Amino acid sequence: SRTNIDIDDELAAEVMRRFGLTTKRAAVDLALRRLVGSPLSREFLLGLEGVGWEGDLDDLRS
């Protein structure tokens, strides 16, 4: 994961301007999370069936 790559400095800063980020680790992280998310394993996702949701969707909508 320690990875040696060319990252456009301007671009990383440009993202730092736009999103009020104070890093590059912040910009890259965001960039990646937005586009493909974070690792969600198959078992996790399947395990959500029956996890429960006690709120009322009618209250939130109508």
Partner: protein, 138 residues
């Protein structure tokens, strides 16, 4: 050459969460098993989902889900006006819209080129008056 994201609506999500066994829940399960890479979240949906999470552990779990999925952003230079437009159109058509946040969700979906999987008549209405791609599982 990337395929269209699939935005699962809160309406379908809830069924899945509750293990109701309805066609919506089954469809969501299928999506999770077979097309996980194409599933997207947006922040209005996320807000809805977390707001109905009463139990704290459950809430925590659902936060993981919502931060784990790729996100289709809300851009307030565009999406709120588009939702308003959608709403007004619906009204003029003589249609009823139960949640203005469904118009927002549809607006963002249209912007992003995403299709919606749902079980809420609002999305049926919206697909009648826009080019929203919506699939009802009710």
């Amino acid at each position: 050459h990337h395929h269209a994201s699939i935005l699962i609506d809160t309406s379908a999500w809830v069924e899945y969460f509750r293990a109701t066994g309805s066609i919506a829940a089954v469809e969501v399960r299928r999506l999770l098993s077979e097309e996980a890479a194409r599933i997207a979240m947006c922040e209005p949906i996320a807000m809805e989902i977390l707001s109905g999470a009463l139990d704290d552990n459950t809430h925590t779990t659902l936060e993981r889900l919502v931060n784990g999925l790729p996100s289709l952003n809300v851009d307030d230079a565009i999406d709120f006006r588009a939702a308003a437009g959608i709403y007004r159109a619906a009204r003029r058509a003589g249609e009823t819209v139960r949640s203005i946040n469904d118009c927002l969700i549809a607006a963002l979906a249209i912007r992003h080129g995403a299709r919606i999987v749902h079980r809420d008549a609002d999305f049926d209405v919206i697909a009648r008056i826009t080019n929203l791609q919506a699939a009802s599982f009710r």
